Design a protein around this motif. Structure first.
Motif, PDB file in Angstrom:
ATOM      1  N   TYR A 232       0.439  -1.325  -0.031  1.00 54.97           N
ATOM      2  CA  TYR A 232      -0.038  -0.129  -0.154  1.00 54.97           C
ATOM      3  C   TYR A 232       1.154   1.580  -0.081  1.00 54.97           C
ATOM      4  O   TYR A 232       2.080   1.351   0.594  1.00 54.97           O
ATOM      5  N   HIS A 318      -4.466  -1.631   7.355  1.00 56.28           N
ATOM      6  CA  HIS A 318      -4.025  -2.600   5.730  1.00 56.28           C
ATOM      7  C   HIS A 318      -4.377  -3.367   5.388  1.00 56.28           C
ATOM      8  O   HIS A 318      -4.939  -3.951   4.327  1.00 56.28           O
ATOM      9  N   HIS A 322      -8.551  -3.961   3.801  1.00 50.86           N
ATOM     10  CA  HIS A 322      -8.230  -3.220   2.248  1.00 50.86           C
ATOM     11  C   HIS A 322      -8.947  -3.445   1.134  1.00 50.86           C
ATOM     12  O   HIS A 322     -10.006  -4.360   0.907  1.00 50.86           O
TER      13      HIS A 322
END
Ligand SMILES: [Cl-]
Ligand SMILES: [Cl-]
Ligand code: NA
Ligand code: NA
Ligand code: NA
Length: 322
Positions: A232, A318, A322
């Protein structure tokens, strides 16, 4: 012996006075020689040529320096490729479509049209004077020299199939992106984490997803500890980003992106279109224009505005959401 005065050049600014024998070809006297793109190597001088400027190859020290300063290349075939392309692109038409310079379809040039339309919507300054000068003219509607330069820099000939992602890469390689920075993190199952910092062209290009938001949330990737891994975006500093993927059906939503490219058809048997998000969604296909409130199609590249982005979510969050 009959002679005329002509000028040779590699940058069309600095001129070099020559006296040519009208009984010999330009090629015998200069090597490969071009008149506004036309190859006159095998032609003997005409009276009407007196005072005209001819491009030649950078075949001595002065010209080698002038050509490098203007184009930022010492490729020996560059001027010939540029002239060869210009002889075609000067015959193309460059309609103004929704306020932007486009290109009427010819010679399989749809990839160039969407690249040119994209440049007029993202903040990008070119480094070679040749591109600065030609792009300024392109913005004003006279884009033949700019298009011929794109062809030359990308080592594509007129008619050759081009890829938009590759073409933008070449253009970005000849642009000032030194201030662009990208920081990424990869969460590798529970084996560890790895941060990566990217700069310049690599900071603004991504291949694998079209969605900037998905990149911020996280994308699934392999690592040494399996496919339970997430990559990410940690930090982005740039005036735009470009997200690319192999063509796939994708919905473009008004107001969520700047512009995009679509590739319809099959591999090496297709066509690019441009979609721009303004007051509504406009689809520019060379000289053609249509509009819609929503757009779905086989999208390959999407451009987004940016300035400064920093994630506000910790790595583990995350990885799991996600
Ligand atoms: Cl520029
Ligand atoms: Cl450059
Ligand atoms: Na621009
Ligand atoms: Na303009
Ligand atoms: Na650069």
């Amino acid at each position: 012996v009959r002679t005329i005065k002509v000028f040779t050049t590699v940058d069309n600014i600095n001129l070099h006075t020559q006296v040519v024998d009208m009984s010999m070809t330009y090629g015998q006297q200069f090597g490969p020689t071009y008149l506004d793109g036309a190859d006159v190597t095998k032609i003997k001088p005409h009276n009407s040529h007196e005072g005209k400027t001819f491009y030649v190859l950078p075949n001595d020290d002065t010209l080698r320096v002038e050509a490098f300063e203007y184009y930022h290349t010492t490729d020996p075939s560059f001027l010939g490729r540029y002239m060869s392309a210009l002889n075609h692109t000067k015959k193309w038409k460059y309609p103004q479509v929704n306020g932007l310079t486009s290109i009427k379809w010819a010679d399989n040039n749809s990839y160039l049209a969407t690249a040119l339309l994209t440049l007029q919507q993202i903040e990008l300054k070119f480094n070679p004077p040749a591109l600065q000068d030609a792009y300024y003219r392109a913005r004003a509607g006279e884009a033949a020299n700019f298009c011929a330069l794109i062809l030359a820099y990308c080592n594509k000939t007129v008619g050759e199939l081009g890829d938009v992602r590759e073409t933008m890469s070449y253009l970005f390689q000849h642009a000032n992106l030194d201030s662009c920075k990208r920081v990424l993190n990869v969460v590798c199952d529970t084996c560890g984490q790895q941060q990566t910092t990217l700069k310049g062209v690599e900071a603004v290009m991504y291949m694998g997803t079209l969605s900037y938001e998905q990149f911020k949330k996280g994308v699934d990737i392999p690592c040494t500890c399996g496919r339970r891994a997430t990559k990410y975006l940690v930090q982005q500093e740039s005036p735009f980003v470009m997200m690319s993927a192999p063509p796939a059906q994708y919905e473009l939503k008004h107001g969520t992106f700047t512009c995009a490219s679509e590739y319809t058809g099959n591999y090496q048997s297709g066509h690019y279109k441009h979609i721009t998000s303004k007051e509504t969604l406009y689809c520019i296909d060379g000289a053609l224009l249509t509009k819609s409130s929503e757009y779905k199609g086989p999208i390959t590249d999407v451009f987004y505005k940016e300035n400064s982005y920093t994630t506000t979510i910790k790595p583990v969050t995350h990885h799991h959401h996600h």
